[PDB]
Write a protein that binds this ligand. Sequence first.
Ligand SMILES: Cc1cc2nc3c(=O)[nH]c(=O)nc-3n(C[C@H](O)[C@H](O)[C@H](O)COP(=O)(O)OP(=O)(O)OC[C@H]3O[C@@H](n4cnc5c(N)ncnc54)[C@H](O)[C@@H]3O)c2cc1C
Ligand SMILES: Cc1cc2nc3c(=O)[nH]c(=O)nc-3n(C[C@H](O)[C@H](O)[C@H](O)COP(=O)(O)OP(=O)(O)OC[C@H]3O[C@@H](n4cnc5c(N)ncnc54)[C@H](O)[C@@H]3O)c2cc1C
Lengths: 149, 149
Amino acid sequence: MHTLYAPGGYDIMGYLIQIMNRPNPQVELGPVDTSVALILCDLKQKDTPIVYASEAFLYMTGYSNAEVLGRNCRFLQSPDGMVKPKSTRKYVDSNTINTMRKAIDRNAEVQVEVVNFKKNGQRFVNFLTMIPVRDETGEYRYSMGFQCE
Amino acid sequence: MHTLYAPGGYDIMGYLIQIMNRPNPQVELGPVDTSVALILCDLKQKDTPIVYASEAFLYMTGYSNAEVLGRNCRFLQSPDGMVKPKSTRKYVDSNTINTMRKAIDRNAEVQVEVVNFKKNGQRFVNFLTMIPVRDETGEYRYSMGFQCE
Ligand SMILES: Cc1cc2nc3c(=O)[nH]c(=O)nc-3n(C[C@H](O)[C@H](O)[C@H](O)COP(=O)(O)OP(=O)(O)OC[C@H]3O[C@@H](n4cnc5c(N)ncnc54)[C@H](O)[C@@H]3O)c2cc1C
Ligand SMILES: Cc1cc2nc3c(=O)[nH]c(=O)nc-3n(C[C@H](O)[C@H](O)[C@H](O)COP(=O)(O)OP(=O)(O)OC[C@H]3O[C@@H](n4cnc5c(N)ncnc54)[C@H](O)[C@@H]3O)c2cc1C
C-alpha cells in the first residue's frame, strides 16, 4: 500500500453533518459526532485505505494512528492483524464479509456485526455501520465507518 | 483534520454538530447544516450581537453582512430596520419578544413565530429557533438561531 493523505486533513465534521442530513437513510444512526469511534476510508485509492481514524477508534482497537492509517480495515479480522484480500477468514463469517464488500462496492449503506480483534488479540464483536460520503465534487469519494464494541 | 472556520474564527460546523448531539433537546430541530438560514450571536458581548450570518440568512432578509454583523437581531422586527432596546414594538407581539428575551437570558432553547421585515420592507412570519452553544470552555458562550420563512 502507498496511500496518500489529503494535505490539510479531512472534513470529518462536514461529513458527519452530511450523514445526519442525508435524505433517504437506509439505516438509522442517530446523532453522531467526532467523539465516537469512526474512520474514513478513501474509495478512490488502492484497496480503500483508512485515511482518518478517530481517537476513540484507536482506543477501542488498541492500535495507533501509524498502525492503522493507509491500510484496509480488514486487518481487524485477525488477532495477528494479518488478513490478505480475497482470503478465507478463519474467524469471520464469510457471508458477513461478502455483505460488507458488496455494499461498499455499490455505495450502499450497510450495518453488520463482525468478529474483530484488538491489537493485544482480544476478541470482540464490532457493530459496524458504513455510510458513503460525497466530497466537494458531489460524488461519492469516501466511506465513513462507525464502530461499536 | 480540516476544521473550516467561518470568517471570524467561528466553528459553525462544530456548533451544528454540537446542537444535533445535545442530550436533552427541548425543541426538535431535525438535521441542520450550513445551507439553511442561521446566525451566531455572542452572549458575552454587549446586547448579544450577531458575529456570523449564513448566506441563506442574508439572502432571506435582504440585508448584507456589513449591515447585520455587530447588531442585535431585533432590527428585523421593523420595516425600517430601526428597533431600540426595551421599546414597545408596533408590529410584533410582546409576549413573543419577551419569550425570546427570557429564554436567551436563561440559556434555554426556544422556538417562536415572529413577524419580521426584509430590507425592502416586505413583511413575513419567521419561524425562529434559538439554541445556546457551548464553546471550548464547556460553558454557554454563543446562541445559534435558525430562521425559516
Ligand atoms: C469506512 C470503512 C470502515 C470499515 N471498518 C471495519 C471494521 O471496523 N472492521 C472490519 O472487520 N471491517 C471493516 N471494514 C471492512 C473491510 O475494510 C472490507 O471492506 C471487508 O472486509 C469486505 O471487503 P474485503 O475486501 O475484505 O473482501 P474479500 O477480501 O473479497 O472477502 C470476501 C469474503 O466473502 C466470501 N465471499 C465472497 N463472495 C461470496 C459469495 N458470493 N458467496 C459466499 N461467500 C462469498 C469470500 O470467501 C471471502 O472470504 C470497513 C470498511 C470501510 C469502507
Ligand atoms: C442567535 C439569535 C438569533 C435571533 N434571531 C432573530 C430573528 O431572526 N428575528 C427576530 O425578530 N429576533 C431574533 N432574535 C431575538 C432578538 O435578538 C432579541 O433577543 C429579542 O427581540 C428579545 O430581546 P430584546 O432585547 O429585544 O428585548 P426587549 O427590547 O427588552 O423587549 C421585550 C418586549 O417585551 C415586552 N415585555 C417585557 N417583559 C414583559 C412582561 N413581563 N409582560 C409583558 N410584556 C413584557 C416589552 O414591552 C418589550 O417591548 C435572535 C436572538 C438570538 C440570540
